[PDB]
Swiss-Prot record, chains A, C:
The chain holds residues 188 to 374 of 561 of the full protein. It comes from the Eukaryota. LCB1 and LCB2 encode essential subunits of the enzyme and form a heterodimer. Component of the SPOTS complex, at least composed of LCB1/2 (LCB1 and/or LCB2), ORM1/2 (ORM1 and/or ORM2), SAC1 and TSC3. Interacts with LCB1 and TSC3. This is Serine palmitoyltransferase 2. The modification N6-(pyridoxal phosphate)lysine is found at K179. The gene is LCB2. The lineage of its organism: Eukaryota, Fungi, Dikarya, Ascomycota, Saccharomycotina.
Swiss-Prot record, chain B:
The chain crosses the membrane at residues 1-33. It is found in: Cytoplasm; Endoplasmic reticulum membrane. Component of serine palmitoyltransferase (SPT), which catalyzes the committed step in the synthesis of sphingolipids, the condensation of serine with palmitoyl CoA to form the long chain base 3-ketosphinganine. It comes from Saccharomyces cerevisiae (strain ATCC 204508 / S288c) (Baker's yeast). This is Serine palmitoyltransferase 1.
Length: 187, 51, 187
């Protein structure tokens, strides 16, 4: 039951590599990573590649872990109303036009954070419109799906299966094993 | 009436003084255009610019 | 007395190259070019490398040929008072901070145009201060010297000789042969 320590020095076994490969094949991506906790995963994911000069556009009903991760990252935050896509497009256009605050220089990058299925409302997000907008305006997409990775879909692949969207359009896919698979952790 | 003629002069003098007290302003203003800046911040912009 | 045509298909002789090398050695640069007229030289020089997104900072007492060339180029123009360097530094700082009009994006480049000796006033320009400013703020320098290339200096080299400034600091040097050498043309 004991583990050696941090994975960078000791604590990696063949079971870990097997699990990562199996998850990557199951989801349909090319490579993946496995973590022991989901809240920590979200709270520590964002600061690795985001900076003060970037912009994050997110919904108003996201989980607390995403909010904590964005707070730790230090980037600018803009929010849009739940279920409004005209407002989202207007916000994206405006933010591209204006630029950075007080200097009006262009942003280095823009990231869109959304959630697959919302537990408090039980509603789905419109993924094809987000894919179309990110293709048109050259933006990146991040999808949070912990309630829909195993319980929804014709075969249980996730939100990308019911809509028929190719998995290669979305940049980062994340989920947790707690809800449906009976074990704790995330990927 | 006579006080009306004096009131005309008073109204002219008041506007003259008001215009005299004002400060110059131009459409093509200085750094104070935005301004939302401080001396420490401006050096960062100057150093960040690359040709 | 007859020539062939434009100096790209026929009309180049060994005398042309000899004059090229002689002028280049006399001035102190590495290479040069010789033209048949000076006004045309100035009127056609600027549009080759300047664009709408660049900025030109020039004195208020420049020759007409420079004004025509800058008008044909299409870049933005800012002017400073004659003999004032505090105003020049303030203008450079402000223009660097503000950026392009109506978009506030940074300029692509900045160029400084001046004259070696002014015929209407008979006064010299303070070259060392210009060199210091261009080194500090990363700007480019253009010097027009047609009245001072042969008549001034301990040996007649120009304005760069009396001040002791190395010729490599200035970017582009121009002049005409009409005033002192008794022949028409420019370089």
């Amino acid at each position: 039951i004991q583990s050696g320590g941090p994975r960078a020095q000791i604590g990696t076994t063949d079971l870990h590599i097997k699990a990562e490969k199996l998850v990557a094949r199951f989801i349909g991506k090319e490579d993946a990573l496995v973590f022991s906790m989901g809240y920590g995963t979200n709270a520590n994911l964002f600061n690795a590649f985001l900076d003060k000069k970037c912009l994050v556009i997110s919904d108003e009903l996201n989980h607390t872990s995403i909010r904590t991760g964005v707070r730790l990252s230090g980037a600018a935050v803009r929010t849009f109303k739940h279920g409004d896509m005209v407002g989202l497009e207007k916000l994206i256009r405006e933010q591209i036009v204006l630029g950075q605050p007080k200097t009006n220089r262009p942003w280095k990058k823009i990231l869109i954070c959304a959630e697959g299925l919302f537990s408090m409302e039980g509603t789905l997000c419109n993924l094809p419109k987000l894919v179309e907008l990110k293709k048109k305006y050259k933006c990146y997409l991040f999808i949070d799906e912990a309630h829909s990775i195993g319980a929804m879909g014709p075969t249980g692949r996730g939100v990308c299966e019911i809509f028929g969207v190719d998995p290669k359009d979305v940049d980062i896919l994340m989920g947790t094993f707690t809800k449906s698979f009976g074990a704790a952790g995330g990927y | 009436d006579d006080p009306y003629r004096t009131t005309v002069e008073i109204g002219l003098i008041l506007y003259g003084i008001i215009y005299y007290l004002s400060k110059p302003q131009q459409k093509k203003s200085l750094q104070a255009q935005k301004p939302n800046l401080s001396p420490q911040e401006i050096d960062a912009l100057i150093e960040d610019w690359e040709p």
